[PDB]
């Protein structure tokens, strides 16, 4: 581990515990998902993006300038975590494309982190040769570089470093006659340098991921890594943390106002459907019941609420008892865990059991068409421009970010200060707004 950035082409050969193995896998999955969501929400170059992702790195300790702390733990964490993601992600072309997008975002940000003094030794450590030119050479060949340069306006050849490269390394660059050539050597600004290195890095990663895809069947024989490595990205929440066992004071009568002021669109419309129908299908019923369990409602409050609502449902109260009260108590109590003991996370809500005719569960952004999304947004009184970028985000299949933007719009705020993954987190933050 000689430098912070590193190109990942030498797999580690150390020995680590299972707990550290899972910690690295989950931490790097969280980092890449955060990179995806932040890059979707913001522009890739803004200081807000830079500082927010720096804070994400600091809370996940994945990169920093060399010191006593950096040498042992963080860069090694980066190494093994990246390779276990290689194993997780080499399954499919779609996952490979996703991983490549996020790792290019990560590597470009990290390169922007590195100060200009250390980029020379980084390229030297990169094992592929590139020679920076001297100031005298730059001054002598400035006119040639400007004359042969791309549409960059003016003669200004600023502080940006210029390197010497074999011509075969920049084929697509020079083949447009937008660079000067000297004895088979090119001279290039920093933006095109990083473009070249990222293209080469994507080529090497594509080949390596294909090779690991050829190596998956042998390495999947293990039983303690199959159920994880099948689903690091597909169906794992990034520490949603809205686990059962929370506390709070909720008044049963206030449920309507709390639904219209603090519920994510899916749960809001589910509660309205319950109020207007006094009956739900299995999926929506279980979803809303365990959500109400999560928000802090106690067992007696939940039972009384559901019984009262089925009073308007017109079935026998003893039938209610025998049929459902067992199910609600089981959800609040004993095992059957991870399906009835837990509050549903957003990634689960979107990927599991899409609603059908007569169903109202499921995230509406992913499970209903844009015209009905627009109708619902009009019914919820959001500005037409806000609805416009909501639909733009829906076209970009970033449903969680769309829900985020809906949250700031309904709360009349700018940034929620997080990235939502759990409806109970949505509700907790809305209560934090008071």
């Amino acid at each position: 581990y000689p430098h912070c950035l590193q190109f990942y082409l030498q797999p580690p050969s150390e020995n680590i515990s299972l707990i550290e193995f899972e910690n690295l896998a989950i931490d790097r999955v969280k980092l890449l998902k955060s990179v995806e969501n932040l890059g979707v929400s913001y522009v890739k170059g803004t200081e807000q993006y830079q500082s927010k992702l720096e804070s994400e790195l600091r809370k996940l300790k994945f990169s920093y300038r060399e010191n006593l702390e950096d040498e042992y733990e963080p860069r090694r964490r980066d190494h093994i975590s990246h390779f276990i993601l290689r194993l997780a992600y080499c399954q499919s072309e779609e996952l490979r494309r996703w991983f490549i997008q996020q790792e290019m975002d990560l590597l470009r940000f990290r390169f922007s982190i590195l100060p200009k003094d250390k980029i020379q030794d980084f390229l030297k450590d990169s094992q592929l040769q590139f020679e920076a030119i001297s100031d005298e050479e730059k001054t002598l060949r400035e006119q040639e570089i400007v004359a042969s340069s791309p549409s960059l306006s003016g003669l200004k050849l600023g502080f940006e470093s210029i390197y010497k490269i074999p011509f075969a390394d920049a084929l697509d660059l020079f083949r447009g006659r937008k660079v000067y050539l000297e004895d088979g050597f090119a001279y290039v600004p920093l933006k095109d340098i990083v473009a070249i290195i990222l293209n080469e890095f994507r080529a090497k990663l594509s080949k390596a991921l294909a090779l690991t895809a050829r190596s998956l069947p042998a390495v999947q024989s293990d039983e303690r890594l199959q159920p994880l490595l099948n689903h690091l990205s597909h169906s794992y929440t990034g520490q949603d943390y809205s686990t059962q066992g929370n506390v709070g004071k909720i008044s049963l009568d206030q449920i309507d106002l709390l639904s219209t002021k603090s519920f994510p669109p899916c749960m809001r419309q589910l509660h309205k459907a319950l109020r207007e129908n006094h009956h739900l299908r299995h999926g929506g019923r279980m979803q809303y019941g365990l959500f109400l369990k999560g928000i802090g409602l106690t067992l007696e409050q939940a039972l009384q609420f559901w019984k009262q609502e089925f009073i308007k449902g017109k079935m026998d109260p003893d039938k209610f008892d025998k049929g459902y009260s067992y199910n609600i108590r089981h959800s609040f109590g004993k095992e059957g865990k991870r399906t009835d003991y837990t509050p549903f996370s957003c990634l689960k809500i979107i990927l599991s059991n899409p609603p059908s005719q007569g169903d109202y569960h499921g995230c509406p952004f992913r499970h209903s068409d844009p015209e009905l999304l627009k109708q619902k947004l009009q019914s919820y009184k959001i500005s037409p421009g806000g609805i416009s970028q909501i639909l733009d985000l829906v076209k970009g299949t970033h449903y969680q970010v769309a829900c985020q933007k809906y949250f700031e719009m309904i709360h009349n705020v700018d940034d929620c200060g997080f990235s939502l993954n759990h409806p109970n987190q949505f509700f907790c933050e809305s209560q934090r707004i008071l």
Binding site: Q91, S92, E93, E94, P354, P355, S356, Q357
Partner: protein, 106 residues
Amino acid sequence: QDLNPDLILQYDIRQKALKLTANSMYGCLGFSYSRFYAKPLAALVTYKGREILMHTKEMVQKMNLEVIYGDTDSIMINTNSTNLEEVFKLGNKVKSEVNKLYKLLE
């Protein structure tokens, strides 16, 4: 139409025989039991088959349905619909799109 039913049965038998002979084409190449045992060639064919079936899996996930079971010889697809004709035309559209994605697959 307007053909002798016996000849129709003969045509059906010939078509089914062609189907099974095709299906066994890969059989004759990958087995230590065979004359032409080609470990690398068989591995490449199986890798491509797994890749294409799995790609079909995620993309049919994209087209807003759900898959529940498939191993290189059948794909189980849930519909979330109760109209048989709608389900059939959904199958037809996914068949057509997968046929234009991969030319010779039937």
